[PDB]
Design a protein around this ligand. Structure first.
Ligand SMILES: [Cl-]
Ligand SMILES: [Cl-]
Ligand SMILES: [Cl-]
Length: 239
């Protein structure tokens, strides 16, 4: 028995978290109702997009380069040539928009439905480079967990090579005791903004899948995406 809502109220943020203990098939959560509510995936979709891009071969491997088009975008790290590992690290949207266009609407829809990702809606072909940023694609925190867990047990239609590459670029933090993988998200086209941190923790010969979802009403709220995840995992004796 642990109060996972404690971290949320300390940081003054509204949101939810869902943690799934793989070995024990057990959930821990705060705000269960929100864990079944749908939100724009934003950059968390890069996990799914990376799998399909590698599987279809529109990007050859983790070091293959896509070049910057010269347009000055919002963040300086985005204004440079990159690969999928650094684009994942930097939340480089334009890189993943190229991947989605090259996958194409028909292949994207097939993988979305085969995987069962979120609400399964990517819109019209004209929305191929923005359906996860502006809609209509949405996903619940529970569905983030289901996707990541199915991914990890090799049920999805991706080769072992594809899985190995994506699981490697997801590495966020690593010590001798644990490997933390995940991806943040920040949907800014809705009010309030929606913050994500989803992924999974490998520790103590177990895997703990997590999905954090918060309201972002000022820029200081954004840092709480990872911090509430950290405090939640430590409340369970992890990290
Ligand atoms: Cl690299
Ligand atoms: Cl950034
Ligand atoms: Cl932003």
């Amino acid at each position: 028995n642990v109060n996972l809502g404690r971290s949320f109220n300390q940081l003054g943020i509204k949101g939810s978290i869902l943690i799934y203990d793989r070995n024990n098939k057990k959930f821990y959560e705060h705000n269960a109702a929100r864990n079944s509510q749908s939100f724009l995936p934003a950059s968390t979709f890069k996990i799914f997009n990376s799998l399909v891009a590698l599987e279809t071969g529109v990007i050859s491997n983790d070091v293959a380069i896509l070049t910057w088009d010269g347009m000055q975008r919002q963040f300086p790290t985005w204004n440079q040539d990159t690969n999928i590992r650094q684009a994942f690290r930097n939340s480089t949207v334009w890189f993943y928009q190229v991947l989605a266009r090259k996958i194409g609407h028909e292949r994207m829809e097939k993988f979305i439905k085969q995987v069962g990702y979120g609400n399964l809606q990517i819109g019209t072909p004209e929305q191929i480079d923005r359906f996860w940023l502006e809609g209509p694609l949405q996903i619940t925190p529970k569905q983030q967990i289901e996707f990541l867990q199915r991914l990890h047990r090799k049920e999805l239609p991706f080769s072992q090579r594809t899985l190995d590459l994506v699981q490697d670029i997801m590495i966020y933090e690593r010590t001798p005791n644990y490997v933390l993988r995940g991806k943040t998200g920040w949907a800014a086209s809705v009010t309030p903004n929606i913050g994500w941190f989803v992924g999974y923790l490998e520790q103590n010969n177990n895997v703990y899948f997590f999905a954090t979802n918060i309201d972002i009403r000022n820029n200081d709220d954004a840092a709480a995406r990872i911090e509430v995840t950290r405090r939640s995992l430590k409340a369970l004796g992890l990290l």
